[PDB]
Amino acid sequence: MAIYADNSYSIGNTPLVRLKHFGHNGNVVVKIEGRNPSYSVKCRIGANMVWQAEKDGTLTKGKEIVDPTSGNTGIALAYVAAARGYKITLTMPETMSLERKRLLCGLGVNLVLTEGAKGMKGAIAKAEEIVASDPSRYVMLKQFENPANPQIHRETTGPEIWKDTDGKVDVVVAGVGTGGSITGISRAIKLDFGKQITSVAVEPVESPVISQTLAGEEVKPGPHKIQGIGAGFIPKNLDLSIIDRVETVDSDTALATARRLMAEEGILAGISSGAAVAAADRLAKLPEFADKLIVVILPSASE
């Protein structure tokens, strides 16, 4: 009954684990998206974005994926492309780690390196150039705007949380990169299951564009070290309407929190998992949130 046709379908069904050294009386519970193909939450959108492109006819036998991503999305797309038999090109700043390069090359990616100094702008520019050269050949999946992104979270991530909490979840805390996670989860719990939970978006204090935007202040992006969050803009896949609260976390707190997850909980999560937990811990220690079950997405693992 339970044999996946390929590795793309093995996505999700990730565990909920209660934290002992965060929250209050066990009110903080984490969902470990590190327990996935390719070791992060992006496995879900890598899978669904391909599936959707196949269904709508935009991706066929023969055609090749092209995408600018310096992160988990690249790894996710590569694994799915490998599992389903697609050629894929990923553009990225030349400054990417040898580890990451080797892993992508190993997955069979055509890696196209761009000028480090030009950063992501460089990579996106080149990706668009490649597609321009033969639009009938190349397809750009577009994680920041593709509805298949939050759609998988609505169908899988959100329902898994509803299910495993017996509908008792009261707050969802997720870092925002594409926004797919918080948006999808939120729509599922609020609209599909009908529960008025608190949806808490998490972003770097160093680049707090969601907080600035909603406050009507000048939006001023900045650099930070919380890999996976803080795009420095509002992505189309963040539905602001479903966000109840926005919490900011600093890089150093985020880091130290991840180290504490490892040493005190035995949970191997990334820096952005640190950022999400720090934010949740802060809510968890407010009397308002004392009787509330807070669920925190940990987007990735640490190797």
Binding site: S70, G74, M96, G177, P221, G222, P223, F233
Partner: peptide
């Protein structure tokens, strides 16, 4: 993700 911008 990796560098939507910055990071």
């Amino acid at each position: 993700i990796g560098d939507g911008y910055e990071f």
